[PDB]
Amino acid sequence: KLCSLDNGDCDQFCHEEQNSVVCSCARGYTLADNGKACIPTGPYPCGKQTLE
Amino acid sequence: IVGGQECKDGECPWQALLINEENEGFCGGTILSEFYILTAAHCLYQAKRFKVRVGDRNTEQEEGGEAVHEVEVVIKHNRFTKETYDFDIAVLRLKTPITFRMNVAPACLPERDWAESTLMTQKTGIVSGFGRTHEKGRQSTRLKMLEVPYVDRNSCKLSSSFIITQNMFCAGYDTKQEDACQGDSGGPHVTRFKDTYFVTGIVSWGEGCARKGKYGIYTKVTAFLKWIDRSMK
Ligand SMILES: CN1CCc2nc(C(=O)N3CCN(S(=O)(=O)c4ccc5cc(Cl)ccc5c4)C[C@@H]3C(N)=O)sc2C1
Numbered sequence: 001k002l003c004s005l006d007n008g009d010c011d012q013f014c015h016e017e018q019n020s021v022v023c024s025c026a027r028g029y030t031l032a033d034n035g036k037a038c039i040p041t042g043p044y045p046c047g048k049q050t051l052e
Numbered sequence: 053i054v055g056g057q058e059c060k061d062g063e064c065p066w067q068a069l070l071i072n073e074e075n076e077g078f079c080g081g082t083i084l085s086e087f088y089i090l091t092a093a094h095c096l097y098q099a100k101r102f103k104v105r106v107g108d109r110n111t112e113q114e115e116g117g118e119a120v121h122e123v124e125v126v127i128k129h130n131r132f133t134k135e136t137y138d139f140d141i142a143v144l145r146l147k148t149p150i151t152f153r154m155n156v157a158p159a160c161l162p163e164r165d166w167a168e169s170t171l172m173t174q175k176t177g178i179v180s181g182f183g184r185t186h187e188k189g190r191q192s193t194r195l196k197m198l199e200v201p202y203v204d205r206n207s208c209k210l211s212s213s214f215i216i217t218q219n220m221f222c223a224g225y226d227t228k229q230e231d232a233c234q235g236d237s238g239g240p241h242v243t244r245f246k247d248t249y250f251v252t253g254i255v256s257w258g259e260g261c262a263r264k265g266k267y268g269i270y271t272k273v274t275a276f277l278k279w280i281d282r283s284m285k
Pocket residue numbers: 134135136137187214215231232233234235236237255256257258259260261262267268269270
């Protein structure tokens with residue numbers, strides 16, 4: 001089920017390569033160490049409502 | 053926007069507004085980056101000279117977050133057709149970069165396959181704008197947003213008195229009276245995924261606004277992601 005099972009546990013982009021999940025992130029995010037979470041590079045990352 | 057709610061502080065920060073020489077909003081756009089605004093090609097015909105306002109929520113008042121930006125380049129999709137509104141997409145490159153701040157920030161561009169498979173199969177997207185609050189009303193002085201169901205493509209085609217091309221999709225409600233309307237055009241349709249908002253559409257056209265048995269028609273952004281990329285150089 002891979003990317004079809006709950007987005008493969010990816011925060012953002014899920015791609016199936018061979019028979020496994022590969023995660024990635026929009027521009028302005030980097031993939032965390034766990035290979036799933038997307039971490040913002042700088043202030044005002046895309047897609048985030050603003051709080052200050 | 054018909055129905056829906058005001059965008060509250062911070063909630064629709066990728067909203068842009070194309071303003072005419074009279075300083076009056078005629079269409080929306082979406083912030084894509086410090087330099088680029090996404091809008092509808094049919095909007096380029098609403099005014100000879102226009103600018104982009106970002107950071108606005110209430111046109112009646114100065115909140116201090118507003119910024120007017122001159123347009124440097126208009127990049128119209130060359131295949132755009134006024135008769136069908138097929139290829140209803142344009143990107144604007146700004147003279148001066150947008151300074152992101154409260155109420156000013158870009159929406160994310162998704163990758164095509166993931167977006168079509170995961171975003172566009174969600175229950176809802178969010179459309180927003182300063183457009184008319186009913187078919188025959190005046191434009192809103194408040195930025196509004198509205199949650200709009202993705203509509204099954206075959207029902208949408210059955211609904212419609214006009215052609216729905218591979219570059220369009222439908223969203224909104226069968227009879228419930230909530231819809232985008234005149235002046236929302238070129239504005240954001242975004243899809244939320246784990247608290248991150250991705251551009252999925254551009255407000256394009258409808259048969260009226262919120263008419264029974266009719267849907268909102270949107271430019272299918274995921275069909276133009278390589279085109280958008282090239283445009284943003
Ligand atoms: C192929 N054609 C493309 C353009 C077109 N416009 C049509 C139409 O019925 N109009 C009345 C509603 N309006 S509107 O109130 O300006 C408008 C604009 C964008 C919209 C987008 C959505 Cl998603 C929903 C309703 C909308 C209504 C669009 C348009 C017009 N005369 O300018 S039908 C049609 C068909």
